[PDB]
Amino acid sequence: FHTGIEIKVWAIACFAPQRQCTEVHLKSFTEQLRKISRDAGMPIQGQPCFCKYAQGADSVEPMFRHLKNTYAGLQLVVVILPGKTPVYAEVKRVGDTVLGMATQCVQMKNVQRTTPQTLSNLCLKINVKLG
Amino acid sequence: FHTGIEIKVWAIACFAPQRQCTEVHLKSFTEQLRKISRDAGMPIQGQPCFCKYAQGADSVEPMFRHLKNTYAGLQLVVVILPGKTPVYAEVKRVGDTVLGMATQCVQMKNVQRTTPQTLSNLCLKINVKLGG
Amino acid sequence: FHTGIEIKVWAIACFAPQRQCTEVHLKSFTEQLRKISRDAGMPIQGQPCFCKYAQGADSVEPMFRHLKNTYAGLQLVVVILPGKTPVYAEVKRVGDTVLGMATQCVQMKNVQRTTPQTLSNLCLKINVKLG
Ligand SMILES: O=c1ccn([C@@H]2O[C@H](COP(=O)(O)O)[C@@H](O)[C@H]2O)c(=O)[nH]1
Numbered sequence: 001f002h003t004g005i006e007i008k009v010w011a012i013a014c015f016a017p018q019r020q021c022t023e024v025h026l027k028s029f030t031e032q033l034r035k036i037s038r039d040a041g042m043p044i045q046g047q048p049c050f051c052k053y054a055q056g057a058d059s060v061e062p063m064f065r066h067l068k069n070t071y072a073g074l075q076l077v078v079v080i081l082p083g084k085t086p087v088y089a090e091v092k093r094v095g096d097t098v099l100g101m102a103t104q105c106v107q108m109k110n111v112q113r114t115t116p117q118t119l120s121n122l123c124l125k126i127n128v129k130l131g
Numbered sequence: 132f133h134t135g136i137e138i139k140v141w142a143i144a145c146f147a148p149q150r151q152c153t154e155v156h157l158k159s160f161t162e163q164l165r166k167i168s169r170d171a172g173m174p175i176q177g178q179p180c181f182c183k184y185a186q187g188a189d190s191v192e193p194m195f196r197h198l199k200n201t202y203a204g205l206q207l208v209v210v211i212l213p214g215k216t217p218v219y220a221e222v223k224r225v226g227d228t229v230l231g232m233a234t235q236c237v238q239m240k241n242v243q244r245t246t247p248q249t250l251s252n253l254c255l256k257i258n259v260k261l262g263g
Numbered sequence: 264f265h266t267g268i269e270i271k272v273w274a275i276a277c278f279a280p281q282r283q284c285t286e287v288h289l290k291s292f293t294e295q296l297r298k299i300s301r302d303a304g305m306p307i308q309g310q311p312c313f314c315k316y317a318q319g320a321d322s323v324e325p326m327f328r329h330l331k332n333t334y335a336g337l338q339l340v341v342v343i344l345p346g347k348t349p350v351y352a353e354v355k356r357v358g359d360t361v362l363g364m365a366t367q368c369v370q371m372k373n374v375q376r377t378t379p380q381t382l383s384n385l386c387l388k389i390n391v392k393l394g
């Protein structure tokens with residue numbers, strides 16, 4: 001576990017349908033993630049700079065290019081996925097290989113229904129990536 | 132207060148549920164405890180040899196017997212408790228009077244959110260128990 | 264894979280229609296699951312303490328509160344679903360975020376006709392949840 005991470009600039013890209021994963025689900029998930037990440041000493045600080053819905057792997061690269069060009073110092077994009085989807089492989093291709101932007105994927109189900117254990121799982125994955 | 136302590140073999144036993152004291156809490160607490168104990172000349176070294184959840188006073192003795200048999204040279208078990216619990220008296224009965232195993236209890240609120248002052252409080256207790 | 268799990272108190276809630284997933288299908292599935300779980304060293308011990316049909320997402324919260332209020336030490340509710348259904352999200356809403364009750368869902372088609380591979384699939388998922 002890496003100490004000293006501070007996530008100041010971060011975004012949400014929700015590829016799950018808004019009807020399943022609504023804005024108030026995203027906001028409640030955000031506040032719970034902020035609380036546990038701060039308590040664990042890897043604070044995800046502030047609201048996300050960007051939080052939008054998209055659909056389809058074909059929307060990943062245009063969205064991620066916009067994010068990279070628009071938010072200097074963006075440190076992480078949290079990517080919400082509707083279960084098993086080609087969006088995952090495209091997010092990793094665009095983020096890790098095309099553009100060089102850290103992404104952390106999370107299942108829609110764990111945003112719809114947050115629990116401490118799944119938030120913890122997510123923080124540990126983010127810690128590996130950013131530490 | 133004793134200088135020159137080195138805690139090389141140590142375990143974590145968490146008797147609060149994972150939903151209350153999650154894996155990221157345990158790992159962050161471990162790393163913060165390693166850092167301050169090293170700076171204060173009583174380093175708790177490395178990763179714990181064992182870090183598991185259990186529930187209820189009845190689980191204490193089998194777990195501690197397992198620990199004593201499995202990890203030779205075990206110097207300390209850090210025991211995470213939710214607060215007041217019968218598990219505390221049983222930890223001390225088994226560790227202090229049955230198996231001769233050092234234990235240090237800590238409340239989950241100070242694992243969920245560490246601070247320098249509460250980690251210092253805990254290191255002072257550990258130093259009393261193990262110094263010398 | 265976790266060793267040392269023993270499932271002593273568990274329930275079945277069947278949201279699939281009885282005319283598709285009958286009592287003999289449920290008993291067969293139960294007994295086959297018990298045998299393979301023992302093979303694998305995660306014995307599901309005893310018959311379920313409760314095995315009933317349920318109709319609709321509206322039945323989830325009343326039934327799960329009834330289970331919590333009636334069976335001390337309940338470890339798992341195995342939930343049989345008729346394919347894709349809103350019942351799934353409600354089961355997880357109640358179990359994971361209201362009452363703190365472990366649930367394992369299974370598709371009705373794999374209760375109507377079990378195979379060792381689908382029983383194994385289910386055992387692995389239970390093992391992760393309870394481990
Ligand atoms: O199709 C997929 C593939 C992975 N995932 C999730 O992505 C997560 C891994 O994301 P990561 O590689 O950014 O760490 C993991 O929790 C998977 O469950 C999906 O939701 N859908």
Ligand SMILES: O=c1ccn([C@@H]2O[C@H](COP(=O)(O)O)[C@@H](O)[C@H]2O)c(=O)[nH]1
Binds near residue numbers: 217234256
């Ligand atoms: O039932 C109890 C008793 C003590 N404790 C805590 O145990 C700590 C002392 O542990 P110790 O005896 O191992 O030094 C102290 O911080 C108490 O707050 C509990 O959490 N529960």
Ligand SMILES: O=c1ccn([C@@H]2O[C@H](COP(=O)(O)O)[C@@H](O)[C@H]2O)c(=O)[nH]1
Binds near residue numbers: 366388
């Ligand atoms: O609407 C749904 C959603 C999931 N399921 C099944 O639920 C299972 C997942 O259950 P779990 O989340 O309890 O592990 C998986 O086998 C899915 O196919 C349904 O049968 N219907």
